[PDB]
Amino acid sequence: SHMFRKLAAESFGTFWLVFGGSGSAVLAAGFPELGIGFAGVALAFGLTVLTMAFAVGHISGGHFNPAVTIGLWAGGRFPAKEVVGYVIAQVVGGIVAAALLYLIASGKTGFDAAASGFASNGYGEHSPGGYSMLSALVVELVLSAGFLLVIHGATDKFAPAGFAPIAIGLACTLIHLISIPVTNTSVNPARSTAVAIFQGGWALEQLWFFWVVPIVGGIIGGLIYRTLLEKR
Amino acid sequence: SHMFRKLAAESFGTFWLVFGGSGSAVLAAGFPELGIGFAGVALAFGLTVLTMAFAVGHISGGHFNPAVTIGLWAGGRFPAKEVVGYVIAQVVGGIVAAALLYLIASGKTGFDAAASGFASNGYGEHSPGGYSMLSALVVELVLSAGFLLVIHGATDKFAPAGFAPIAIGLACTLIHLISIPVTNTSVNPARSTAVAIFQGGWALEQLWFFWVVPIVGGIIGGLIYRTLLEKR
Amino acid sequence: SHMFRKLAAESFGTFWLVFGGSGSAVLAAGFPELGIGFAGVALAFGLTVLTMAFAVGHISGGHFNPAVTIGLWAGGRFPAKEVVGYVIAQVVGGIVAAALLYLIASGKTGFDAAASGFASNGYGEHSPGGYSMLSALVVELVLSAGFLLVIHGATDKFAPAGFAPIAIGLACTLIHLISIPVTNTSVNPARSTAVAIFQGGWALEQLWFFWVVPIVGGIIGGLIYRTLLEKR
Amino acid sequence: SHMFRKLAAESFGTFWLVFGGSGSAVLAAGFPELGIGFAGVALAFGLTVLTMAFAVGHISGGHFNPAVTIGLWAGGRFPAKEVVGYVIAQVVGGIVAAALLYLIASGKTGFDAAASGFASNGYGEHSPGGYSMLSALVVELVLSAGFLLVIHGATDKFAPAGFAPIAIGLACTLIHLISIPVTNTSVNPARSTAVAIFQGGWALEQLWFFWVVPIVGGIIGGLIYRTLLEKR
Question: Are C159 and D58 in contact (CB under 8 A)?
């Protein structure tokens, strides 16, 4: 319940998320004949939220995501003052994991961080299924809103205590099963930023998208729970 | 505990279910070499129930399904008066998600909502494994009954509190692992309706089946728990 | 807490298990290009235990398995008098599901219940990987023991209440991930019996094995928890 | 709460882990056309921790891992005196499972424990993806630290009671989704030791690595939770 340690929890959580989620995508998804595919990456991603929320959610609330922190503010749960420190902690944490991951990935003949996307988020060409920008937009907006509708509900007063990390993490596996072919799935501006810095080309130029669209998405989910469903 | 907000919860839950479940099937199941297959779609489907039940089950009970609402009435848990509003909320919610999904899917060269089924439920030709009508019937009846036998038991007085969304959602992954090759799996009349409206052809003509057969199925499960297992 | 209803719970649980587990194996495991494989069947199997234990475990204890009932007796948890009724309830339940399943499977051109094993358990030729009898024995004995070491521990006094259906069901997914290539996995004499009656040939002649070996296995697990780990 | 029985719990837990995790890898991962792949093995591995922690964690704490026991000491949770007995119990348990597994695997024509690695951990050639030693190091250090950051947090005073076996086991599935292509994943010095003794060649010579690197890794995670995040 001291801020220095709350920021440490958040930096570590987002770290776990970016190391785990992206590590599975770069290291294991495509491994020939025995690789884990998109369903594997979705699972890893959502177990980074669930393990860490159980571990450090009781210290920080376990946001691990700028879009979650900003949406908790929108829905009346996080004070405007603590927002910016969390976002930075998260972004920092994610950068370190993505650099550690890069050093790992390059331990193998042929690794092209650039020519493989390095699990970066993108739309259009740099969409893995080649979905246009309007497909990228509508999917992140809907999925960020929803994501926050889950965090808000799961951690509500009259939501039986203890289970929110299960609700929230699995909602993060769900969201990846849905949107990977479309954008590789962000709904986390700090996840996109980590790997974009190591794809070095096309990722960095579409980055802004995955900062604007998840956040707007998550405010909306916060607004929908706050005004519609919470009262009571 | 106001009805307007309870209907909002239900519309949103069924929305999540149709966006998630169907979105995974249309967007990710068949993606070449890395796609999530039938086991992926089953998982997504059952995480739409579990996240949303945790999130909004404490507001509405989190039915998200006409067949569940009608079966809760049969087993003595939902009053006849509130049934019709829930069913409509659910059906509406599902329609919006299925339209949003359609706009997403069409962001990609080659998308034929019609020639691909758009994850609609069907029997005979329009059964993915080509199972006859009697296979379609017996599987939905058994699986709807069972589904409701789980909801009834999991949310029973003497069922330790908190865990029903886990029981109920996973029962929804289970049911999809079983029946997808047979009918693409409905046991949800509001799920079938959402996508059927966008397959535009063969789906709409078999629709009625997936309204009659899940409901009958779910009343039966409600009746079996009510008279057999609840008393005590 | 009346016996007639406790037997109904057990018949229904074992029913769910045999319909689900085997239904996934016969209907979905091998479906070309999108099928769920051995990992899918393992999951379905273990979600039949978890949903039903949550649903009817509070009525019966949710054994769903002759080897579990007989091992609960060994470890001092189930009285010798109630054993035989449970075993029969379980076996009956399983027979009905396996017949319903058969009617479903035959709704499709080419279905050979006999030439495909119908997910029956077997050793030697009728082992899917062709493991000898000594491989069949050691795997079921170890896995039945373990299974019961989990039921005993998970439902122990000083095991925090509520979570045993998660522990026990997932132990049932685990056990299938391990042993499917070896014997298709029984550790449930009532599961083997259900489908063996519909494979009609080689299954019925190896049946006895999967009645003797799981039970011995589960008594041992009961004995190991009772004398070693419970006291205290 | 007697030591003889606490050592029995630990020997049995590590046993389950090595039988399950490795059994899935040797028996099921590569089975042609229906095998469970790396995502299957990751799941089995992490369900050995979760079932056993639920089962025997309330007796011992359910460490099942020298690196976990040594890291619990570092983070101030396990007394230095009880460390060595646990490590040996764990190592013994694991040896027995790995021998039982070997007898199982050899029940099939063609089984070469040596030419197949027998799911042993290795770096360089004997890395399944051919990742250099510096990739092996950084991945285990990060993943052991993290692993212990999860155990510490999940079992913390102010972590709602009951859920730590879910947090901890799933963190063990996560860690395998990440690192299998790189080293087959150890973060468990007692897991590596079990199978290394049966690969008989290259495993035994790289062994030391997977004793030094996980432990250092897990002390660090213990140190990071102790000094940074616990106070309060």
Answer: yes
